[PDB]
Design a protein around this motif. Sequence first.
Motif, short mmCIF file in Angstrom:
data_model
loop_
_atom_site.label_atom_id
_atom_site.label_comp_id
_atom_site.label_asym_id
_atom_site.label_seq_id
_atom_site.Cartn_x
_atom_site.Cartn_y
_atom_site.Cartn_z
N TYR A 129 57.37 35.72 38.29
CA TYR A 129 55.99 36.05 37.93
C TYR A 129 55.77 35.81 36.44
O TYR A 129 56.57 36.23 35.60
N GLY A 130 54.67 35.14 36.12
CA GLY A 130 54.39 34.67 34.78
C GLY A 130 54.82 33.24 34.52
O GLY A 130 54.31 32.62 33.58
N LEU A 166 59.26 42.48 35.86
CA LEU A 166 58.37 41.35 36.11
C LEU A 166 58.28 41.04 37.59
O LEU A 166 57.18 40.83 38.11
N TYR A 187 41.62 33.94 14.03
CA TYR A 187 42.39 34.99 14.69
C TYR A 187 43.44 34.40 15.64
O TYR A 187 44.56 34.90 15.71
N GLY A 188 43.07 33.36 16.39
CA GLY A 188 44.03 32.75 17.30
C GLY A 188 45.19 32.10 16.58
O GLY A 188 46.35 32.24 16.99
N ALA A 193 47.44 34.92 15.39
CA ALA A 193 48.26 35.52 16.44
C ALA A 193 49.40 34.60 16.84
O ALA A 193 50.56 35.03 16.96
C1 LIG Z 1 53.98 38.18 33.17
C2 LIG Z 1 52.71 38.99 33.29
C3 LIG Z 1 51.74 38.72 32.16
C4 LIG Z 1 52.25 39.16 30.80
C5 LIG Z 1 51.38 38.69 29.65
C6 LIG Z 1 49.91 38.99 29.83
C7 LIG Z 1 49.06 38.59 28.64
C8 LIG Z 1 49.41 39.34 27.36
C9 LIG Z 1 48.63 38.88 26.15
C10 LIG Z 1 47.13 38.94 26.32
C11 LIG Z 1 46.34 38.39 25.15
C12 LIG Z 1 46.47 39.20 23.87
C13 LIG Z 1 45.76 38.56 22.69
C14 LIG Z 1 46.39 37.26 22.24
C15 LIG Z 1 45.51 36.42 21.33
C16 LIG Z 1 44.90 37.19 20.17
C17 LIG Z 1 44.09 36.30 19.23
C18 LIG Z 1 42.85 35.74 19.86
O1 LIG Z 1 42.47 35.97 20.97
O2 LIG Z 1 42.20 34.94 19.01
C19 LIG Z 1 40.96 34.35 19.47
C20 LIG Z 1 39.81 35.15 18.93
C21 LIG Z 1 39.10 34.44 17.81
O3 LIG Z 1 37.91 35.18 17.47
P1 LIG Z 1 36.75 34.47 16.63
O4 LIG Z 1 36.58 33.08 17.12
O5 LIG Z 1 37.04 34.70 15.20
O6 LIG Z 1 35.45 35.32 17.00
C22 LIG Z 1 35.12 35.73 18.35
C23 LIG Z 1 35.00 37.22 18.32
N1 LIG Z 1 35.27 37.76 16.96
O7 LIG Z 1 40.39 36.39 18.40
C24 LIG Z 1 39.69 37.52 18.53
O8 LIG Z 1 38.59 37.58 18.99
C25 LIG Z 1 40.49 38.70 18.05
C26 LIG Z 1 40.41 39.89 18.99
C27 LIG Z 1 41.57 40.87 18.82
C28 LIG Z 1 41.45 42.12 19.67
C29 LIG Z 1 42.70 42.97 19.75
C30 LIG Z 1 43.85 42.33 20.52
C31 LIG Z 1 44.96 43.29 20.89
C32 LIG Z 1 46.00 42.71 21.84
C33 LIG Z 1 46.93 41.70 21.19
C34 LIG Z 1 48.13 42.31 20.49
C35 LIG Z 1 49.12 42.98 21.44
C36 LIG Z 1 50.38 43.49 20.76
C37 LIG Z 1 51.42 44.05 21.72
C38 LIG Z 1 52.70 44.52 21.04
C39 LIG Z 1 53.77 45.02 21.99
C40 LIG Z 1 55.05 45.46 21.29
C41 LIG Z 1 56.11 45.96 22.24
#
Ligand SMILES: CCCCCCCCCCCCCCCCCC(=O)OC[C@H](COP(=O)(O)OCCN)OC(=O)CCCCCCCCCCCCCCCCC
Lengths: 56, 459, 121, 140, 99, 87
Positions: B210-211, B264, D107-108, D111
Amino acid sequence: NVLQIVRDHWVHILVPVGFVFGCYLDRRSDEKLTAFRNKSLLFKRELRPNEEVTWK
Amino acid sequence: MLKIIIPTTMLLPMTWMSKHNMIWINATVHSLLISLISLSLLNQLGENSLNFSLTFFSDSLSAPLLVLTTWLLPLMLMASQSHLSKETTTRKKLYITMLILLQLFLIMTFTATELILFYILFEATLVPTLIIITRWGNQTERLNAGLYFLFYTLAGSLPLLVALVYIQNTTGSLNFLIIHYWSHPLSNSWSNIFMWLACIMAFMVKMPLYGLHLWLPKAHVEAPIAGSMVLAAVLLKLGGYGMMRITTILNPLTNYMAYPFLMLSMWGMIMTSSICLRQTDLKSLIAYSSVSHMALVIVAIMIQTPWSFMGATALMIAHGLTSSMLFCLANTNYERVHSRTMILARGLQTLLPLMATWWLVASLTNLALPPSINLIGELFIITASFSWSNITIILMGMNMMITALYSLYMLITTQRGKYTHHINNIKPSFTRENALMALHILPLLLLTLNPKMILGPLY
Amino acid sequence: TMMSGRPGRVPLQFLPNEARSLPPPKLTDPRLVYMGFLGYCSGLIDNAIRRRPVVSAGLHRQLLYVTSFVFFGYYLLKRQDYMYALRDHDMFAYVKSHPEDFPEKDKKTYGEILEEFHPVR
Amino acid sequence: AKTLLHKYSDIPEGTECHRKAYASTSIGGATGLIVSAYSIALKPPASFLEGVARTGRYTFTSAAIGAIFGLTSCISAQVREKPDDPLNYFIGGCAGGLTLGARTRSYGIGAAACAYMGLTAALVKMGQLEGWQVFAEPKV
Amino acid sequence: IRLQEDPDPEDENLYEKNPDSHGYDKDPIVDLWNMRVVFFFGFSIVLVLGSTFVAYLPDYRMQEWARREAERLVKYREANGLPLMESNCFDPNKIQLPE
Amino acid sequence: EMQWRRDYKVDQEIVNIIQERLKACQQREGESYRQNCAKELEQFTQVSKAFQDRYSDLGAHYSARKCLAKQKQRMLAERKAAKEAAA
Ligand SMILES: CCCCCCCCCCCCCCCCCC(=O)OC[C@H](COP(=O)(O)OCCN)OC(=O)CCCCCCCCCCCCCCCCC
């Protein structure tokens, strides 16, 4: 028409002759691994009066 | 093993030298004969495997997979007869050649005695599958499906090659018997962690995990019927066979590295079953069900107990047969109406009774109705997981409930209800299709009668 | 480079005189059969490219393909076997000449050897 | 480059955070200068002022990434009192990636850079601990 | 239009030209013999013969041998008062602990 | 390894024999099994404990070497316990 039957159905012997050739090759490969024949501790045995190899 | 290998390399020239209207007959007859010959490999010993030569050996895990492949080839030939009526003679011969090469590579992969030869053949299986998909698929997405499949597999498997050559240099041999007898514990260091990651991740991408599984819906939806049959039934089991083989040298580090993959796999069972609940495509539903079952097999292999390997082997065989049957039924329905949408055609029990019976039997086997080998494997895996921990029972129970839900949902949607009024090209089921379904289903019940043949070497 | 510069190596010699002490490959060698198979495949590809009946045209040139491939494969196999024999000979000679670098170790039975047990649960 | 790497490695891990940050900033500045030189050589600027501006932007971005990485890693190691831990390098690498994302206003990009830089910094720390070598000397 | 392309042909029905079609081939004789060989070989030969072959495969797994050996060992152990199952798999006399 | 595997299968069949004895005794006694068939329960307890101690959680890749390592560990633990008791 017998020639036509052969000319069309001669491909039906390929798999059988391949099976026979594979069996022959398996036996020929088995004959190359006779280093421990009648020499293992578990199956060491005196040969019978009319016998030369325990297995082929 | 040459007595089985050579007849396939004779199937090739026979196919290329047969008449234009006899290719299917010759291929089917001789594939059935080869399957009958390969049935002799089920006479396994109790302590050690069958060592034919320095290159090929057969075990209680290899024998059922070889029998499954040799049995699956003629069914793929029948399906190809179904969907390749208007193709030219040379292209039909090329399709049969691709199927034969894939079967030969699978046989050699299952009977290989060394890890490097196993890797070479297990990667050699990619070429025929990619050619089949990207050449005889019906829709535009076949190219993207082939790219995703190939690159997922290769990105998984290249570090496996690096790890294998490193292991050979370090230890001396990659022969399975030697690496089993001369096995030594793996210390808990970063280098060992990364070697474990290389091997396991390769086989998990192949599994899939998965994933790392999007390639599976992409390839199975867009592949032709024979490609879908071989992808779901046998090619998915290469990862399980490899994990059951490669984990000999990964202990005791497997006791520490198994947590992420176990979580997973279990949450993936749940998620993929839930996805199956709301799928508008029948082939996608079958593909995600395959993903869930393979995740269960992953859980069994990772917990790695004697009761989990038997369940893993039984579930692999049962899932292969069941998924092949489901794909065949879906392909018949598609060929009738030329669309994969599930809610497009209804009332198929009113229009086609015998196909409704086949659908009922296939869906009952999918949801692990006792005493089927599907249920046998699932129950063994569940018991081993319960011994491992006592919340895996909760996860397995909810997964089983959702599995029954979506199986009966697809059955009721396709077969029951009021028939579509404007679909007036539903011809009676062909004898070929009925025989295909019967040949899929009867071995399942026979293996239910005799279950000790597919319980692996730990029986 | 490992083998190049070995003492007594005559340049541009495919098979030296010391290579004649080794068993020549059997004419029924699987490697020779594979070389002949490659020649036959090359002949079939030649027919296909030149747009002739693949399995029935140019029998003489197909035979020439097979014969040339078998000939070159036989000589290549002889050279390969000679090179591997030479490598093994040099390895054994060096092991004999450096016993302090390649010493014998004590063989302890598993009853004497202590190894940690890791339960699987 | 070898001298700068030797200085960085000779500065102790958990101590002398200011000197560690200075060494990392010097390494980043050298990398940025090299990248700027290659960029000017391959894609010529419109004018000398524009070329100087591009060089300054690249050098400042690289130096900021290096300084943030060094400071974050050293501070984390010191406060946790756990040297020889790849987690400190992972935190420093993600901090540098976020700094790059802030510099590029994306932001992307931030990240993805955090994830990749943290992963590769953790790999570098693991290699330092375990004795991994990238350019191995011919041995066999 | 963008190409000189053939129109999509209508799908052919095998039952129109042959009401007794088995679905294998559009030629009646070839279809009949394909059905006959598939049914005969697959069902009869594979199913019946392989099933009885697997049913009567010799006991090379030594299940019955293991049962007889277990019966013999149980009889000998309980006849002489010895424990049915030994405490250790190997001999502590042959095992030398490090000390 | 082959000898050890044969011994392992024989021990499994011994455990099966004892379990069959226990089941038959319980069914035969019927309503008074908790007291009458207590002799089979003790034999089954002893056999099960010995079998568990020997072929305990060795994993799916069990071997004679792993069983020997487990036995050595158990012997070391017993020796240490005996020493700390009578020392
Ligand atoms: C196998 C099963 C599946 C397992 C995996 C599942 C998926 C997991 C990951 C999901 C996605 C998380 C986010 C990853 C990308 C973050 C950056 C991003 O999205 O950038 C694009 C966007 C650009 O934004 P912009 O164009 O500037 O303007 C639009 C709105 N402002 O940026 C934004 O709009 C910024 C928004 C940020 C909001 C907060 C995000 C919080 C979550 C990400 C951090 C998580 C950290 C976890 C740490 C764990 C440690 C143990």
